[PDB]
Design a protein around this nucleic acid. Structure first.
Lengths: 133, 212, 95, 90
RNA sequence: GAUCGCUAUAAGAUGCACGAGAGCGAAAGCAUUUCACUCAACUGUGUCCAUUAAUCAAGAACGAAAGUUAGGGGAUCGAAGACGAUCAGAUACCGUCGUAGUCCUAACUAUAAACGAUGUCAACCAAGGAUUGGAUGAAA
RNA sequence: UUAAUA
RNA sequence: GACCUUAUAGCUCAGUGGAGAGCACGGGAUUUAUAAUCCCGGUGUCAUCGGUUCGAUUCCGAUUAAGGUCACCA
């Protein structure tokens, strides 16, 4: 019958955090303290260079949606984010693919947002004066 | 199975908002010395204002609430804070103008100590031809002093519950622009964030008055 | 000798300006010498905007954009094709 | 009289250039007269480690080991005044 | 029980977007807002003095960063150092960790592509458009 | 990614 | 002198009851040519004598070389 813990169609929030080396799809409850399912792009691949690939992002996104609907979560809020502490604030290539995969899995997206942490003022960046060479 | 021990609670915001229920939150079932109603005494919920008031014109703000006590599968949320949406805050920072910021610690009439942040921008006039519209250091200090003093009077008289409802009315940003236009042409004035520096004392009766 | 009258900077009756970090290589460049570009883009690519709209939970939600300011060093701006090498007589154009 | 060894010429040549330098700054500040906070006279001289006496004013003041008022002892006095005014006002 | 998510903390450091061929300063340099203490300059003047001026061997203040001495602090980054890659080798570029240092107080040091590679003062000097701060008319 | 010499 | 250990390609090492590795060398390819790179090949008396040995380069003695430790109280 009903999977224990599931309820009527409710709202979840998906924390899509895709850097250039991986991608995280992580849905939590409205309070954000309880997590429904957390799948990363590195669990759906073999090599270490494909963890940020768009295919690994949608594959992890479909598995998130399948568990969410089965657990009663039918509509999601999106919080897009990249590694933006002091590094490049641009989200990785798999973040968009994961967001599109959630939509194509018949999920009702709510409010989308970019929550990359923009520093009011930064600590010293890695690399030195002359930077990556 | 991870969710076999999980149960969902309905979330109830105070009566000040058009929408009373905003969603469901999860918690593990009761245990030996781990009461579920106890483990929900500090959870923070971030809700957009558009959902609360059922109007998309209120979508620029995000409100925050805190679960204080469990009324039989129901949290009785109280206002925890507000914050502008990230996309809106970065869209109102133009380049060739002067950015004016401020913050005031106001003690509400009911005992809440809150910090209110205001942001404003110099604007371009109708017949203005030059590209840049900057203000001197003297005009900036006058403008900040005006918005420091005016925001304190509005929030010192009204308690926290009514002041937040007063923020929904656009009187304060409209009043500040009209009052500050005597010093410099201002167009964009927003209250980007409100905190709660010191929570004023509350009673179960006071929460009951704030929940139907 | 002097390839540029302004030395490639935007500096004037100042004479020390703070450093900013390059967006790509993380190099330290002065604020005026840095190659500054502005970006305003939607957080949904043009492919998925239709797909987002079809299965949504909001009637008239307006998709928000993202705004960020990118600063590149000269080395990391020429290589990324942000700025190209111009002609000797076309260097003077500031438009 | 001397090129650079002013007060530590009594130590001769037998304690190390660095140690004679460190002890010089302390011994100058320990033997000097300070402005006396109650009568504004350069009449305070040390009588013991931490006890200072206004010669022409008849007051005994507790202070630092070698200086009448220490840097840490001055910030603390300023800090308490700020705390006291804040407490006295709401 | 990592990465990830929410909530609370207490120090260090930093001061985004505004932020510019814009402002100030003798140069070095100066960016959270308030309150004080100072300082300089411009404009306005039927105010005072009456050559008091310019440049200046010797001489004197200030002088980025790094470095030294003694306390505090010690978050981030990181000469040395240690690993893992790459390579013919790699003591390097790439990745991980990391001492001195980076930060504040007192005292030394007195050098930079300390550059406008253009000494200080003064006179004359072709066309413009725009800008920062005053004065003065018109236009609310 | 690597690419020394006459 | 007394105890212990070792001896295998041209050089450093592996492994042995029925001889690998590397570096070197030779030929072919890539290159304008060398170096690097790719492909293939040829290299060991298992230090010299005796015995056990089914059969010894291995196991047991001997002769050599090579080292390591000890050589004290007077």
């Amino acid at each position: 019958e009903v999977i224990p813990g599931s309820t009527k169609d409710a709202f979840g929030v998906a924390h899509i955090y895709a850097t250039f080396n991986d991608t995280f799809v992580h849905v939590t409850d409205i309070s954000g303290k309880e997590t429904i399912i957390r799948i990363t792009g590195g669990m759906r691949v073999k090599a270490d260079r494909d963890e940020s690939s768009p295919y690994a992002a949608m594959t992890a996104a479909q598995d998130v949606a399948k568990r969410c609907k089965d657990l009663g979560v039918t509509s999601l809020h999106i919080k897009m984010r990249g590694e933006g502490g002091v590094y490049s604030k641009t989200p990785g290539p798999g973040a968009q693919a994961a967001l599109r995969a959630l939509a194509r899995a018949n999920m009702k997206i709510g409010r989308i947002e970019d929550v990359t942490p923009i520093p009011t003022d930064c600590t010293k960046r890695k690399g030195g004066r002359r930077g990556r060479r | 199975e991870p969710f076999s021990k999980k149960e969902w609670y309905n979330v109830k915001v105070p009566k000040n908002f058009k929408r009373r229920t905003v969603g469901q939150i999860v918690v593990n079932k009761t245990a030996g010395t781990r009461i579920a109603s106890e483990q929900l005494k500090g959870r923070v919920v971030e809700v957009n204002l558009a959902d609360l008031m059922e109007n998309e014109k209120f979508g620029a703000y995000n409100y925050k609430f805190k679960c204080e006590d469990v009324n039989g599968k129901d949290c009785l949320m109280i206002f925890h804070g507000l914050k502008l949406t990230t996309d809106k805050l970065r869209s109102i920072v133009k380049k060739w103008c002067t950015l004016i910021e401020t913050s005031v610690d106001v003690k509400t009439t009911d005992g809440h100590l809150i910090r209110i942040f205001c942001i404003g921008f110099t604007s371009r006039k109708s017949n203005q031809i030059k590209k840049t519209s900057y203000a001197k250091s003297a005009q900036i200090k006058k403008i900040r002093k005006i918005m420091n003093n005016l925001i304190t009077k509005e929030a010192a008289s009204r308690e926290l519950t009514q002041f937040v409802d007063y923020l929904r009315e656009n009187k304060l940003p409209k009043e500040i622009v009209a009052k500050c236009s005597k010093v410099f042409s201002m167009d964009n004035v927003y209250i980007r964030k409100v905190k709660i520096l010191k929570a004023g004392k509350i009673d179960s009766l006071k929460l009951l008055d704030q929940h139907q | 000798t002097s390839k540029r009258r302004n030395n490639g900077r935007s500096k004037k009756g100042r004479g020390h300006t703070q450093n900013v970090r390059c967006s790509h290589c993380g190099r330290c460049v002065p604020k005026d010498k840095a190659i500054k570009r502005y970006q305003i883009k939607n957080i949904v690519e043009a492919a998925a905007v239709r797909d987002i709209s079809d299965n949504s939970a909001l009637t008239k939600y307006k998709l928000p954009k993202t705004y960020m300011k990118l600063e590149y060093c000269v080395s990391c701006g020429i290589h990324g094709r942000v700025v190209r090498v111009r002609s000797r007589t076309d260097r003077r154009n500031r438009l | 009289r001397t090129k650079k060894v002013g007060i530590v010429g009594k130590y001769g040549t037998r304690y190390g250039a660095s140690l004679r330098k460190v002890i010089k700054k302390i011994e100058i500040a320990q033997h000097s007269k300070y402005v006396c906070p109650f009568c504004c006279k350069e009449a305070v001289r040390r009588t013991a480690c931490g006890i200072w006496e206004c010669k022409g004013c008849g007051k005994q003041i507790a202070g630092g080991a070698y200086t009448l008022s220490t840097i840490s002892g001055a910030t603390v006095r300023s800090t308490v005044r700020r705390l006291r005014d804040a407490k006295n006002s709401q």
